[PDB]
PDB file of C-alpha atoms (C1' of nucleotides) and ligand atoms in Angstrom:
ATOM      1  CA  UNK D   1      20.173 -11.110   4.767  1.00  0.00           C
ATOM      2  CA  UNK D   2      16.642 -10.270   5.881  1.00  0.00           C
ATOM      3  CA  UNK D   3      16.009 -11.217   9.496  1.00  0.00           C
ATOM      4  CA  UNK D   4      13.195 -11.771  11.992  1.00  0.00           C
ATOM      5  CA  UNK D   5      13.539  -8.313  13.600  1.00  0.00           C
ATOM      6  CA  UNK D   6      12.173  -6.500  10.531  1.00  0.00           C
ATOM      7  CA  UNK D   7       9.194  -8.757   9.769  1.00  0.00           C
ATOM      8  CA  UNK D   8       7.268  -8.690  13.071  1.00  0.00           C
ATOM      9  CA  UNK D   9       7.498  -4.888  13.015  1.00  0.00           C
ATOM     10  CA  UNK D  10       6.193  -4.915   9.430  1.00  0.00           C
ATOM     11  CA  UNK D  11       3.297  -7.365   9.670  1.00  0.00           C
ATOM     12  CA  UNK D  12       4.462 -10.510   7.891  1.00  0.00           C
ATOM     13  CA  UNK D  13       3.381 -12.842  10.733  1.00  0.00           C
ATOM     14  CA  UNK D  14      -0.386 -12.446  10.150  1.00  0.00           C
ATOM     15  CA  UNK D  15      -2.428 -15.139   8.432  1.00  0.00           C
ATOM     16  CA  UNK D  16      -6.128 -15.436   7.628  1.00  0.00           C
ATOM     17  CA  UNK D  17      -8.831 -16.506  10.073  1.00  0.00           C
ATOM     18  CA  UNK D  18      -9.207 -20.026  11.447  1.00  0.00           C
ATOM     19  CA  UNK D  19     -11.968 -21.018   9.027  1.00  0.00           C
ATOM     20  CA  UNK D  20     -10.039 -20.394   5.806  1.00  0.00           C
ATOM     21  CA  UNK D  21      -6.687 -22.028   6.581  1.00  0.00           C
ATOM     22  CA  UNK D  22      -5.251 -24.837   4.515  1.00  0.00           C
ATOM     23  CA  UNK D  23      -4.488 -28.014   6.559  1.00  0.00           C
ATOM     24  CA  UNK D  24      -1.266 -28.555   4.568  1.00  0.00           C
ATOM     25  CA  UNK D  25       0.140 -25.330   6.088  1.00  0.00           C
ATOM     26  CA  UNK D  26       0.192 -26.831   9.597  1.00  0.00           C
ATOM     27  CA  UNK D  27       4.046 -27.120   9.640  1.00  0.00           C
ATOM     28  CA  UNK D  28       4.145 -23.302   9.312  1.00  0.00           C
ATOM     29  CA  UNK D  29       1.670 -22.120  11.987  1.00  0.00           C
ATOM     30  CA  UNK D  30       2.407 -20.942  15.540  1.00  0.00           C
ATOM     31  CA  UNK D  31      -1.160 -20.836  16.894  1.00  0.00           C
ATOM     32  CA  UNK D  32      -4.271 -18.649  16.698  1.00  0.00           C
ATOM     33  CA  UNK D  33      -4.326 -15.268  18.450  1.00  0.00           C
ATOM     34  CA  UNK D  34      -7.852 -13.768  18.368  1.00  0.00           C
ATOM     35  CA  UNK D  35      -9.269 -16.291  15.844  1.00  0.00           C
ATOM     36  CA  UNK D  36      -6.426 -15.472  13.385  1.00  0.00           C
ATOM     37  CA  UNK D  37      -3.436 -17.707  12.709  1.00  0.00           C
ATOM     38  CA  UNK D  38       0.018 -16.505  13.661  1.00  0.00           C
ATOM     39  CA  UNK D  39       2.881 -17.815  11.544  1.00  0.00           C
ATOM     40  CA  UNK D  40       6.120 -19.043  13.089  1.00  0.00           C
ATOM     41  CA  UNK D  41       8.827 -16.647  11.853  1.00  0.00           C
ATOM     42  CA  UNK D  42      11.419 -19.185  13.069  1.00  0.00           C
ATOM     43  CA  UNK D  43      10.341 -21.178   9.996  1.00  0.00           C
ATOM     44  CA  UNK D  44      10.121 -18.129   7.716  1.00  0.00           C
ATOM     45  CA  UNK D  45      13.519 -16.380   7.782  1.00  0.00           C
ATOM     46  CA  UNK D  46      15.594 -19.547   7.021  1.00  0.00           C
ATOM     47  CA  UNK D  47      13.024 -20.268   4.279  1.00  0.00           C
ATOM     48  CA  UNK D  48      13.114 -16.719   2.870  1.00  0.00           C
ATOM     49  CA  UNK D  49      16.908 -16.505   2.574  1.00  0.00           C
ATOM     50  CA  UNK D  50      16.818 -20.045   1.175  1.00  0.00           C
ATOM     51  CA  UNK D  51      14.870 -18.584  -1.744  1.00  0.00           C
ATOM     52  CA  UNK D  52      17.075 -15.493  -2.123  1.00  0.00           C
ATOM     53  CA  UNK D  53      20.405 -17.333  -2.294  1.00  0.00           C
ATOM     54  CA  UNK D  54      19.175 -19.264  -5.333  1.00  0.00           C
ATOM     55  CA  UNK D  55      18.204 -15.979  -6.963  1.00  0.00           C
ATOM     56  CA  UNK D  56      21.892 -15.263  -6.517  1.00  0.00           C
ATOM     57  CA  UNK D  57      22.511 -18.251  -8.809  1.00  0.00           C
ATOM     58  CA  UNK D  58      19.891 -17.604 -11.489  1.00  0.00           C
ATOM     59  CA  UNK D  59      20.859 -13.941 -11.695  1.00  0.00           C
ATOM     60  CA  UNK D  60      24.482 -15.036 -12.080  1.00  0.00           C
ATOM     61  CA  UNK D  61      23.797 -16.037 -15.698  1.00  0.00           C
ATOM     62  CA  UNK D  62      21.347 -13.237 -16.648  1.00  0.00           C
ATOM     63  CA  UNK D  63      18.484 -15.704 -16.393  1.00  0.00           C
ATOM     64  CA  UNK D  64      15.025 -14.293 -16.978  1.00  0.00           C
ATOM     65  CA  UNK D  65      13.102 -13.845 -13.711  1.00  0.00           C
ATOM     66  CA  UNK D  66       9.355 -13.290 -14.136  1.00  0.00           C
ATOM     67  CA  UNK D  67       7.613 -11.662 -11.162  1.00  0.00           C
ATOM     68  CA  UNK D  68       3.922 -12.324 -10.539  1.00  0.00           C
ATOM     69  CA  UNK D  69       1.430 -10.253  -8.616  1.00  0.00           C
ATOM     70  CA  UNK D  70      -2.115  -9.454  -9.823  1.00  0.00           C
ATOM     71  CA  UNK D  71      -3.926  -8.674  -6.543  1.00  0.00           C
ATOM     72  CA  UNK D  72      -4.142  -4.896  -7.363  1.00  0.00           C
ATOM     73  CA  UNK D  73      -3.045  -4.316  -3.760  1.00  0.00           C
ATOM     74  CA  UNK D  74       0.579  -4.313  -4.951  1.00  0.00           C
ATOM     75  CA  UNK D  75       0.168  -4.190  -8.721  1.00  0.00           C
ATOM     76  CA  UNK D  76       1.947  -0.829  -8.751  1.00  0.00           C
ATOM     77  CA  UNK D  77       4.536  -2.199  -6.335  1.00  0.00           C
ATOM     78  CA  UNK D  78       5.426  -5.177  -8.518  1.00  0.00           C
ATOM     79  CA  UNK D  79       6.246  -3.122 -11.626  1.00  0.00           C
ATOM     80  CA  UNK D  80       8.758  -0.798  -9.932  1.00  0.00           C
ATOM     81  CA  UNK D  81      10.333  -3.697  -8.047  1.00  0.00           C
ATOM     82  CA  UNK D  82      10.750  -5.462 -11.388  1.00  0.00           C
ATOM     83  CA  UNK D  83      12.076  -2.278 -13.015  1.00  0.00           C
ATOM     84  CA  UNK D  84      14.803  -1.927 -10.387  1.00  0.00           C
ATOM     85  CA  UNK D  85      16.736  -4.806 -11.979  1.00  0.00           C
ATOM     86  CA  UNK D  86      14.737  -4.502 -15.288  1.00  0.00           C
ATOM     87  CA  UNK D  87      13.163  -7.950 -14.846  1.00  0.00           C
ATOM     88  CA  UNK D  88       9.690  -9.056 -15.828  1.00  0.00           C
ATOM     89  CA  UNK D  89       6.230  -8.704 -14.366  1.00  0.00           C
ATOM     90  CA  UNK D  90       2.576  -9.453 -14.979  1.00  0.00           C
ATOM     91  CA  UNK D  91       0.853  -6.810 -12.835  1.00  0.00           C
ATOM     92  CA  UNK D  92      -2.671  -6.929 -14.295  1.00  0.00           C
ATOM     93  CA  UNK D  93      -4.464 -10.161 -15.273  1.00  0.00           C
ATOM     94  CA  UNK D  94      -2.318 -13.192 -16.034  1.00  0.00           C
ATOM     95  CA  UNK D  95      -3.552 -14.455 -19.385  1.00  0.00           C
ATOM     96  CA  UNK D  96      -4.381 -18.146 -19.338  1.00  0.00           C
ATOM     97  CA  UNK D  97      -1.747 -20.113 -21.180  1.00  0.00           C
ATOM     98  CA  UNK D  98       0.855 -17.362 -21.170  1.00  0.00           C
ATOM     99  CA  UNK D  99       3.685 -19.871 -20.709  1.00  0.00           C
ATOM    100  CA  UNK D 100       2.315 -23.162 -22.079  1.00  0.00           C
ATOM    101  CA  UNK D 101       0.881 -21.425 -25.152  1.00  0.00           C
ATOM    102  CA  UNK D 102       3.772 -18.994 -25.572  1.00  0.00           C
ATOM    103  CA  UNK D 103       4.124 -18.906 -29.385  1.00  0.00           C
ATOM    104  CA  UNK D 104       0.464 -17.852 -29.685  1.00  0.00           C
ATOM    105  CA  UNK D 105       0.969 -15.106 -27.102  1.00  0.00           C
ATOM    106  CA  UNK D 106       4.216 -14.314 -28.975  1.00  0.00           C
ATOM    107  CA  UNK D 107       2.053 -13.053 -31.869  1.00  0.00           C
ATOM    108  CA  UNK D 108       0.483 -10.508 -29.493  1.00  0.00           C
ATOM    109  CA  UNK D 109       3.808  -9.327 -28.084  1.00  0.00           C
ATOM    110  CA  UNK D 110       4.692  -8.422 -31.688  1.00  0.00           C
ATOM    111  CA  UNK D 111       1.486  -6.441 -32.281  1.00  0.00           C
ATOM    112  CA  UNK D 112       2.195  -4.579 -29.032  1.00  0.00           C
ATOM    113  CA  UNK D 113       5.663  -3.752 -30.388  1.00  0.00           C
ATOM    114  CA  UNK D 114       4.279  -2.316 -33.635  1.00  0.00           C
ATOM    115  CA  UNK D 115       1.591  -0.186 -31.972  1.00  0.00           C
ATOM    116  CA  UNK D 116       4.136   1.260 -29.535  1.00  0.00           C
ATOM    117  CA  UNK D 117       6.588   2.029 -32.356  1.00  0.00           C
ATOM    118  CA  UNK D 118       3.938   3.674 -34.566  1.00  0.00           C
ATOM    119  CA  UNK D 119       2.863   6.120 -31.841  1.00  0.00           C
ATOM    120  CA  UNK D 120       6.333   7.494 -31.008  1.00  0.00           C
ATOM    121  CA  UNK D 121       8.881   6.405 -33.633  1.00  0.00           C
ATOM    122  CA  UNK D 122       6.402   6.255 -36.537  1.00  0.00           C
ATOM    123  CA  UNK D 123       5.427   9.971 -36.672  1.00  0.00           C
ATOM    124  CA  UNK D 124       2.733   9.262 -39.281  1.00  0.00           C
ATOM    125  CA  UNK D 125       0.095  11.979 -39.226  1.00  0.00           C
ATOM    126  CA  UNK D 126      -3.084  12.627 -41.267  1.00  0.00           C
ATOM    127  CA  UNK D 127      -4.775   9.227 -41.026  1.00  0.00           C
ATOM    128  CA  UNK D 128      -8.393   8.126 -40.616  1.00  0.00           C
ATOM    129  CA  UNK D 129      -9.535   9.781 -37.397  1.00  0.00           C
ATOM    130  CA  UNK D 130     -12.296   7.361 -36.379  1.00  0.00           C
ATOM    131  CA  UNK D 131      -9.876   4.560 -37.226  1.00  0.00           C
ATOM    132  CA  UNK D 132      -7.096   6.488 -35.428  1.00  0.00           C
ATOM    133  CA  UNK D 133      -8.436   5.645 -31.983  1.00  0.00           C
ATOM    134  CA  UNK D 134      -9.273   1.954 -32.411  1.00  0.00           C
ATOM    135  CA  UNK D 135      -5.574   1.724 -33.290  1.00  0.00           C
ATOM    136  CA  UNK D 136      -4.870   3.882 -30.219  1.00  0.00           C
ATOM    137  CA  UNK D 137      -7.179   2.032 -27.822  1.00  0.00           C
ATOM    138  CA  UNK D 138      -5.537  -1.189 -29.028  1.00  0.00           C
ATOM    139  CA  UNK D 139      -2.156  -0.070 -27.652  1.00  0.00           C
ATOM    140  CA  UNK D 140      -3.464   0.817 -24.184  1.00  0.00           C
ATOM    141  CA  UNK D 141      -5.166  -2.615 -23.907  1.00  0.00           C
ATOM    142  CA  UNK D 142      -2.049  -4.561 -24.977  1.00  0.00           C
ATOM    143  CA  UNK D 143       0.214  -2.409 -22.794  1.00  0.00           C
ATOM    144  CA  UNK D 144      -2.117  -3.401 -19.958  1.00  0.00           C
ATOM    145  CA  UNK D 145      -1.792  -7.180 -19.637  1.00  0.00           C
ATOM    146  CA  UNK D 146       1.296  -7.900 -21.791  1.00  0.00           C
ATOM    147  CA  UNK D 147       3.315  -4.769 -21.082  1.00  0.00           C
ATOM    148  CA  UNK D 148       5.666  -6.358 -18.581  1.00  0.00           C
ATOM    149  CA  UNK D 149       6.976  -8.860 -21.114  1.00  0.00           C
ATOM    150  CA  UNK D 150       7.498  -6.612 -24.139  1.00  0.00           C
ATOM    151  CA  UNK D 151      11.279  -7.058 -23.681  1.00  0.00           C
ATOM    152  CA  UNK D 152      11.614 -10.746 -22.734  1.00  0.00           C
ATOM    153  CA  UNK D 153      11.748 -12.933 -25.838  1.00  0.00           C
ATOM    154  CA  UNK D 154      10.961 -16.428 -24.551  1.00  0.00           C
ATOM    155  CA  UNK D 155      10.385 -18.400 -21.363  1.00  0.00           C
ATOM    156  CA  UNK D 156      11.868 -17.273 -18.035  1.00  0.00           C
ATOM    157  CA  UNK D 157      13.903 -19.377 -15.641  1.00  0.00           C
ATOM    158  CA  UNK D 158      12.245 -18.520 -12.314  1.00  0.00           C
ATOM    159  CA  UNK D 159       8.754 -17.574 -11.196  1.00  0.00           C
ATOM    160  CA  UNK D 160       8.381 -15.301  -8.177  1.00  0.00           C
ATOM    161  CA  UNK D 161       4.720 -15.343  -7.047  1.00  0.00           C
ATOM    162  CA  UNK D 162       2.883 -13.317  -4.368  1.00  0.00           C
ATOM    163  CA  UNK D 163      -0.263 -15.383  -3.636  1.00  0.00           C
ATOM    164  CA  UNK D 164      -0.421 -19.065  -4.436  1.00  0.00           C
ATOM    165  CA  UNK D 165      -4.202 -19.560  -4.572  1.00  0.00           C
ATOM    166  CA  UNK D 166      -4.886 -16.288  -6.334  1.00  0.00           C
ATOM    167  CA  UNK D 167      -2.266 -17.199  -8.936  1.00  0.00           C
ATOM    168  CA  UNK D 168      -2.875 -20.953  -9.040  1.00  0.00           C
ATOM    169  CA  UNK D 169      -3.079 -20.922 -12.847  1.00  0.00           C
ATOM    170  CA  UNK D 170       0.361 -19.304 -13.157  1.00  0.00           C
ATOM    171  CA  UNK D 171       1.837 -22.019 -10.919  1.00  0.00           C
ATOM    172  CA  UNK D 172       0.367 -24.877 -12.987  1.00  0.00           C
ATOM    173  CA  UNK D 173       1.715 -23.322 -16.176  1.00  0.00           C
ATOM    174  CA  UNK D 174       5.157 -23.379 -14.569  1.00  0.00           C
ATOM    175  CA  UNK D 175       4.587 -26.831 -13.103  1.00  0.00           C
ATOM    176  CA  UNK D 176       4.141 -28.396 -16.528  1.00  0.00           C
ATOM    177  CA  UNK D 177       7.194 -26.681 -18.052  1.00  0.00           C
ATOM    178  CA  UNK D 178       9.757 -27.320 -15.309  1.00  0.00           C
ATOM    179  CA  UNK D 179      10.269 -23.672 -14.341  1.00  0.00           C
ATOM    180  CA  UNK D 180      10.907 -23.459 -10.569  1.00  0.00           C
ATOM    181  CA  UNK D 181       8.425 -21.510  -8.455  1.00  0.00           C
ATOM    182  CA  UNK D 182       9.461 -19.186  -5.601  1.00  0.00           C
ATOM    183  CA  UNK D 183       6.115 -18.222  -4.074  1.00  0.00           C
ATOM    184  CA  UNK D 184       4.778 -16.497  -0.976  1.00  0.00           C
ATOM    185  CA  UNK D 185       2.294 -18.964   0.479  1.00  0.00           C
ATOM    186  CA  UNK D 186      -0.206 -17.485   2.922  1.00  0.00           C
ATOM    187  CA  UNK D 187      -2.050 -19.893   5.211  1.00  0.00           C
ATOM    188  CA  UNK D 188      -5.021 -20.356   2.875  1.00  0.00           C
ATOM    189  CA  UNK D 189      -2.928 -21.176  -0.191  1.00  0.00           C
ATOM    190  CA  UNK D 190      -1.795 -24.605  -1.445  1.00  0.00           C
ATOM    191  CA  UNK D 191       2.002 -25.140  -1.413  1.00  0.00           C
ATOM    192  CA  UNK D 192       2.104 -28.233  -3.658  1.00  0.00           C
ATOM    193  CA  UNK D 193       2.951 -26.580  -6.965  1.00  0.00           C
ATOM    194  CA  UNK D 194       5.445 -24.314  -5.201  1.00  0.00           C
ATOM    195  CA  UNK D 195       9.019 -25.584  -5.106  1.00  0.00           C
ATOM    196  CA  UNK D 196      10.153 -23.006  -2.497  1.00  0.00           C
ATOM    197  CA  UNK D 197       7.322 -22.101  -0.124  1.00  0.00           C
ATOM    198  CA  UNK D 198       7.772 -18.849   1.825  1.00  0.00           C
ATOM    199  CA  UNK D 199       5.096 -18.351   4.524  1.00  0.00           C
ATOM    200  CA  UNK D 200       3.941 -14.864   5.407  1.00  0.00           C
ATOM    201  CA  UNK D 201       1.327 -12.182   4.880  1.00  0.00           C
ATOM    202  CA  UNK D 202       0.378 -10.955   1.412  1.00  0.00           C
ATOM    203  CA  UNK D 203      -2.090  -8.140   2.091  1.00  0.00           C
ATOM    204  CA  UNK D 204      -0.117  -5.592   4.085  1.00  0.00           C
ATOM    205  CA  UNK D 205       1.547  -3.391   1.468  1.00  0.00           C
ATOM    206  CA  UNK D 206       4.692  -3.137   3.612  1.00  0.00           C
ATOM    207  CA  UNK D 207       5.050  -6.946   3.664  1.00  0.00           C
ATOM    208  CA  UNK D 208       4.897  -7.182  -0.131  1.00  0.00           C
ATOM    209  CA  UNK D 209       7.288  -4.213  -0.198  1.00  0.00           C
ATOM    210  CA  UNK D 210       9.707  -6.164   2.024  1.00  0.00           C
ATOM    211  CA  UNK D 211       9.413  -9.278  -0.176  1.00  0.00           C
ATOM    212  CA  UNK D 212       9.944  -7.550  -3.536  1.00  0.00           C
ATOM    213  CA  UNK D 213      12.856  -5.533  -2.123  1.00  0.00           C
ATOM    214  CA  UNK D 214      15.432  -8.197  -1.277  1.00  0.00           C
ATOM    215  CA  UNK D 215      14.159 -10.387  -4.100  1.00  0.00           C
ATOM    216  CA  UNK D 216      15.166  -7.533  -6.391  1.00  0.00           C
ATOM    217  CA  UNK D 217      18.285  -6.777  -4.335  1.00  0.00           C
ATOM    218  CA  UNK D 218      19.890 -10.160  -4.937  1.00  0.00           C
ATOM    219  CA  UNK D 219      18.990  -9.920  -8.634  1.00  0.00           C
ATOM    220  CA  UNK D 220      20.544  -6.447  -8.556  1.00  0.00           C
ATOM    221  CA  UNK D 221      23.495  -8.129  -6.841  1.00  0.00           C
ATOM    222  CA  UNK D 222      23.446 -10.872  -9.468  1.00  0.00           C
ATOM    223  CA  UNK D 223      23.412  -8.465 -12.413  1.00  0.00           C
ATOM    224  CA  UNK D 224      26.410  -6.688 -10.884  1.00  0.00           C
ATOM    225  CA  UNK D 225      27.930 -10.149 -10.446  1.00  0.00           C
TER     226      UNK D 225
ATOM    227  C1'   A E   1     -24.758 -42.684 -61.137  1.00  0.00           C
ATOM    228  C1'   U E   2     -23.213 -36.895 -62.219  1.00  0.00           C
ATOM    229  C1'   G E   3     -21.293 -31.682 -63.866  1.00  0.00           C
ATOM    230  C1'   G E   4     -23.148 -26.573 -64.294  1.00  0.00           C
ATOM    231  C1'   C E   5     -27.463 -23.855 -62.466  1.00  0.00           C
ATOM    232  C1'   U E   6     -31.764 -22.928 -59.138  1.00  0.00           C
ATOM    233  C1'   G E   7     -35.414 -23.253 -55.179  1.00  0.00           C
ATOM    234  C1'   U E   8     -35.955 -22.951 -49.854  1.00  0.00           C
ATOM    235  C1'   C E   9     -35.021 -22.342 -44.604  1.00  0.00           C
ATOM    236  C1'   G E  10     -33.095 -17.067 -44.921  1.00  0.00           C
ATOM    237  C1'   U E  11     -30.346 -11.590 -45.209  1.00  0.00           C
ATOM    238  C1'   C E  12     -32.509 -15.719 -40.053  1.00  0.00           C
ATOM    239  C1'   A E  13     -26.987 -14.439 -37.136  1.00  0.00           C
ATOM    240  C1'   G E  14     -24.679 -17.751 -37.067  1.00  0.00           C
ATOM    241  C1'   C E  15     -21.142 -22.155 -38.443  1.00  0.00           C
ATOM    242  C1'   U E  16     -15.934 -23.247 -37.363  1.00  0.00           C
ATOM    243  C1'   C E  17     -10.640 -23.835 -36.596  1.00  0.00           C
ATOM    244  C1'   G E  18      -4.977 -23.582 -34.845  1.00  0.00           C
ATOM    245  C1'   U E  19      -2.229 -23.450 -30.363  1.00  0.00           C
ATOM    246  C1'   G E  20      -3.355 -24.287 -25.197  1.00  0.00           C
ATOM    247  C1'   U E  21      -5.933 -26.396 -21.167  1.00  0.00           C
ATOM    248  C1'   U E  22      -9.736 -29.880 -18.602  1.00  0.00           C
ATOM    249  C1'   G E  23     -11.738 -35.039 -19.270  1.00  0.00           C
ATOM    250  C1'   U E  24      -9.744 -42.517 -19.063  1.00  0.00           C
ATOM    251  C1'   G E  25     -13.297 -41.339 -23.303  1.00  0.00           C
ATOM    252  C1'   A E  26     -17.595 -39.157 -26.909  1.00  0.00           C
ATOM    253  C1'   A E  27     -15.980 -34.291 -26.335  1.00  0.00           C
ATOM    254  C1'   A E  28     -15.930 -29.482 -23.427  1.00  0.00           C
ATOM    255  C1'   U E  29     -13.611 -24.317 -23.209  1.00  0.00           C
ATOM    256  C1'   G E  30     -12.910 -20.308 -26.876  1.00  0.00           C
ATOM    257  C1'   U E  31     -18.860 -19.207 -28.681  1.00  0.00           C
ATOM    258  C1'   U E  32     -20.321 -18.620 -21.734  1.00  0.00           C
ATOM    259  C1'   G E  33     -21.455 -14.171 -17.965  1.00  0.00           C
ATOM    260  C1'   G E  34     -22.893  -8.456 -17.232  1.00  0.00           C
ATOM    261  C1'   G E  35     -25.061  -4.814 -20.097  1.00  0.00           C
ATOM    262  C1'   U E  36     -25.981  -3.406 -25.219  1.00  0.00           C
ATOM    263  C1'   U E  37     -27.252  -3.756 -30.537  1.00  0.00           C
ATOM    264  C1'   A E  38     -30.655  -4.433 -36.528  1.00  0.00           C
ATOM    265  C1'   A E  39     -26.629  -7.946 -35.842  1.00  0.00           C
ATOM    266  C1'   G E  40     -21.251 -13.469 -32.630  1.00  0.00           C
ATOM    267  C1'   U E  41     -23.074  -5.488 -32.662  1.00  0.00           C
ATOM    268  C1'   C E  42     -19.606  -3.558 -29.177  1.00  0.00           C
ATOM    269  C1'   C E  43     -17.602  -3.012 -24.225  1.00  0.00           C
ATOM    270  C1'   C E  44     -16.377  -5.414 -19.664  1.00  0.00           C
ATOM    271  C1'   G E  45     -15.580  -9.852 -17.009  1.00  0.00           C
ATOM    272  C1'   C E  46     -13.705 -14.825 -17.530  1.00  0.00           C
ATOM    273  C1'   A E  47      -7.729 -20.919 -18.806  1.00  0.00           C
ATOM    274  C1'   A E  48      -7.982 -19.016 -22.383  1.00  0.00           C
ATOM    275  C1'   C E  49      -5.239 -16.884 -26.368  1.00  0.00           C
ATOM    276  C1'   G E  50      -5.655 -15.882 -31.515  1.00  0.00           C
ATOM    277  C1'   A E  51      -7.942 -16.586 -36.488  1.00  0.00           C
ATOM    278  C1'   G E  52     -11.348 -17.690 -40.621  1.00  0.00           C
ATOM    279  C1'   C E  53     -16.328 -17.889 -43.170  1.00  0.00           C
ATOM    280  C1'   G E  54     -20.751 -15.003 -42.289  1.00  0.00           C
ATOM    281  C1'   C E  55     -22.285  -8.808 -39.742  1.00  0.00           C
ATOM    282  C1'   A E  56     -20.952  -3.950 -41.061  1.00  0.00           C
ATOM    283  C1'   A E  57     -17.842  -1.026 -44.448  1.00  0.00           C
ATOM    284  C1'   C E  58     -16.464  -0.767 -49.633  1.00  0.00           C
ATOM    285  C1'   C E  59     -20.878  -1.075 -55.300  1.00  0.00           C
ATOM    286  C1'   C E  60     -25.632   0.890 -57.188  1.00  0.00           C
ATOM    287  C1'   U E  61     -29.900   4.104 -56.729  1.00  0.00           C
ATOM    288  C1'   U E  62     -32.628   8.443 -54.486  1.00  0.00           C
ATOM    289  C1'   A E  63     -31.854  13.199 -51.562  1.00  0.00           C
ATOM    290  C1'   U E  64     -28.855  19.110 -50.956  1.00  0.00           C
ATOM    291  C1'   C E  65     -24.844  21.916 -52.998  1.00  0.00           C
ATOM    292  C1'   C E  66     -20.531  23.174 -55.856  1.00  0.00           C
ATOM    293  C1'   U E  67     -17.276  23.759 -60.095  1.00  0.00           C
ATOM    294  C1'   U E  68     -15.974  22.643 -65.034  1.00  0.00           C
ATOM    295  C1'   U E  69     -19.200  21.515 -69.777  1.00  0.00           C
ATOM    296  C1'   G E  70     -24.191  24.163 -72.638  1.00  0.00           C
ATOM    297  C1'   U E  71     -26.938  21.324 -77.933  1.00  0.00           C
ATOM    298  C1'   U E  72     -30.955  18.657 -80.575  1.00  0.00           C
ATOM    299  C1'   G E  73     -31.407  21.522 -73.792  1.00  0.00           C
ATOM    300  C1'   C E  74     -32.624  26.233 -71.753  1.00  0.00           C
ATOM    301  C1'   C E  75     -35.042  31.724 -71.936  1.00  0.00           C
ATOM    302  C1'   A E  76     -33.705  35.262 -66.551  1.00  0.00           C
ATOM    303  C1'   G E  77     -32.620  40.299 -67.816  1.00  0.00           C
ATOM    304  C1'   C E  78     -32.086  41.879 -73.286  1.00  0.00           C
ATOM    305  C1'   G E  79     -34.141  43.915 -80.127  1.00  0.00           C
ATOM    306  C1'   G E  80     -38.818  42.556 -82.685  1.00  0.00           C
ATOM    307  C1'   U E  81     -42.708  39.611 -84.130  1.00  0.00           C
TER     308        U E  81
HETATM  309 MG1   MG F   1      -7.069 -35.391 -22.057  1.00  0.00          MG
HETATM  310 MG1   MG F   2     -10.084 -27.095 -28.838  1.00  0.00          MG
HETATM  311 MG1   MG F   3     -18.534 -24.042 -26.984  1.00  0.00          MG
HETATM  312 MG1   MG F   4     -22.281 -22.119 -31.437  1.00  0.00          MG
HETATM  313 MG1   MG F   5     -23.394 -11.403 -24.016  1.00  0.00          MG
HETATM  314 MG1   MG F   6     -18.083 -10.452 -36.133  1.00  0.00          MG
END
RNA sequence: AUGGCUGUCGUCAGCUCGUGUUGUGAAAUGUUGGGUUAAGUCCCGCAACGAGCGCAACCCUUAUCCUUUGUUGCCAGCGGU
């Protein structure tokens, strides 16, 4: 699907410097041009479409596909790419224990549902005005970190992740539950908890646009399927 | 040997717990950090997320007005002592 002639133009093949690299990433490194690692795209494209063709499978049963990015470099990009195929995101801070301790965080999805309903569908006026805003500032703080999963219900089946050592907690919560992990592993990040490592850059906004596109496109193809 | 009741630390701001995680284990996190407050007071940050008992608010008293109600209270303008 996605090939090598789009990525080099975009800026996927850039890693960090040569003092921050992870020595486990050495099967995915071409060399070091100007003190900065270059990633072999010959081992990126067959390992990017390897991850997409299984999102053909999991979107061929309407399986729940949670997208993860909290860098705030593409926090706005991860919502809209998850709202293309109306799948799920955590764009601001991943709460610790969101998946292992789900039925506790379930009680806060419900409170988010009642504060969203009361503002629009409730239409209840003439209430205590200094109390009216602590109810109102509650909504905007639960829309913030839980707002991507207001319409999910349970645990997902996949876990698409943008950085693997910025989101190391979200990997370990899907390690211990048996949810597969489809992550983008830059050359500083640890690929052990990731089941399907995808090397590349994660700081150019075009690169994370390219990733989230065809990840959503096969789930858009799966929903049509 | 106790029940009920009280003193005191001390009206000092604290003492916990479920689910989760880390640790072989006693346990730890939550409760820490940045500011702030009379205050675990509030905001922000943070593998934590939530909750309870205590922190305040609801009760009483004092302070200004307003209306209804005027005797055993009152006496302003209104007859005479
Ligand atoms: Mg243990
Ligand atoms: Mg505990
Ligand atoms: Mg503690
Ligand atoms: Mg304590
Ligand atoms: Mg503090
Ligand atoms: Mg309190």
